[PDB]
Amino acid sequence: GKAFDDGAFTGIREINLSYNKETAIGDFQVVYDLNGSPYVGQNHKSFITGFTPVKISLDFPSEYIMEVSGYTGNVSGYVVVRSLTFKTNKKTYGPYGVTSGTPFNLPIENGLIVGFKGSIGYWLDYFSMYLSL
Amino acid sequence: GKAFDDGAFTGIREINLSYNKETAIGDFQVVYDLNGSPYVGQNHKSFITGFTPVKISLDFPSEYIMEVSGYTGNVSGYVVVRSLTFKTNKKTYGPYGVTSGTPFNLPIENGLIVGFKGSIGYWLDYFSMYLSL
Amino acid sequence: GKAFDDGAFTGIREINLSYNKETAIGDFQVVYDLNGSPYVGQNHKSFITGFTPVKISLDFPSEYIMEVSGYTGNVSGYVVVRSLTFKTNKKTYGPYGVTSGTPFNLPIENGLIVGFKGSIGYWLDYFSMYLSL
């Protein structure tokens, strides 16, 4: 898939992703906070369409992500991120996608997610996160 | 003076300041690097005019600031930053302004200057810097 | 179980843990690096005995942990860390313990594990890690 790297920012304001309850996660785009100002990240899109869009608006700066979990699995022979869930200090968003395969979760005692990077072909191949104090 | 705070970024690409060889530093504006892309910072201007502009273009990312020095002094009864000097790993820019008053210098063994904040009335009242690895 | 928190250090030199191939992880103790000098961490022991000791000596500082994975599961009604695996840039140590339950993994693109904290009763109840550049 096509790789992407948004880099790091001051925080996260909104997350826009899409999925298919039969395959995996599709598009991914984030609206970060850049020193108090909204910064619209580049929209990373799937090579195909047919996904269901989902918008996750966070109550910045009082609401922030505390944990990220999901499933990675096999789809058409490719290992991809099939499901994703974002738990903040105020609410839980998801799961989105197919909750099948091998689970993974990232709880954060101290710190913030300040950036995303990954790859997207037909689906989200993989992703990593930037952590900061 | 009017306070400003650019926040933090990935690095510094260019610095645009002005001064008067009789008074102190006037305007201040920085072009930061935001995850590989130039980010034009807000131009913080003096309440008055008559300054000499100076552009400091750095060879980003191979050239970075290693030390910042200057003088703070008294002008019309206000304590301000009269002089400023930026020494990178490739060249020395300055001094700019009046080299009179009490000196200050910030050498950096490990780390980078990733942001500026301060205040500007007729002159640059004061400033602080964001440091990062 | 009894909680512990080693705090943060400069790095990791050696890890000493014990396990039982039928239950879960038992004892845990780490020898950290404190600014170039070995620092023997407190040995956190299980309330019971019967575990198999394992010593993981890392080639500090050229060898460091890149990923930590394992399984959390149910043992006598308590949720504990049943298995643990440390993958460095030179070797893979483990799995140690029972590879059954729900999996978790922490891959690190950039950064180092500089400290551990957790809880131990009959078994390792849970644990968290300190990350640093």
């Binding site: 898939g1 790091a8 999901g70 990675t72 490719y78 290992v79 991809v80 991120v81 993974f104 990232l106 300040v114 950036g115 990077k117 990954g118 790859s119 989200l124 191949d125 993989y126 992703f127 990593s128 996160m129 930037y130 952590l131 900061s132 | 970024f9 990935t10 690095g11 510094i12 690097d33 750095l58 980003f60 990312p61 191979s62 050239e63 970075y64 980078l112 990733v114 990062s132 690895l133 | 993994n105 922490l106 891959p107 690190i108 693109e109 950039n110 950064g111 990350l131 640093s132 550049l133």
Partner: peptide, 15 residues
């Protein structure tokens, strides 16, 4: 170099 770095965890998914 002159690029600021930060901690990065992952990736999860395709290796």
């Amino acid at each position: 170099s002159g690029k600021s770095q930060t901690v990065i965890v992952g990736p999860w998914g395709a290796k």
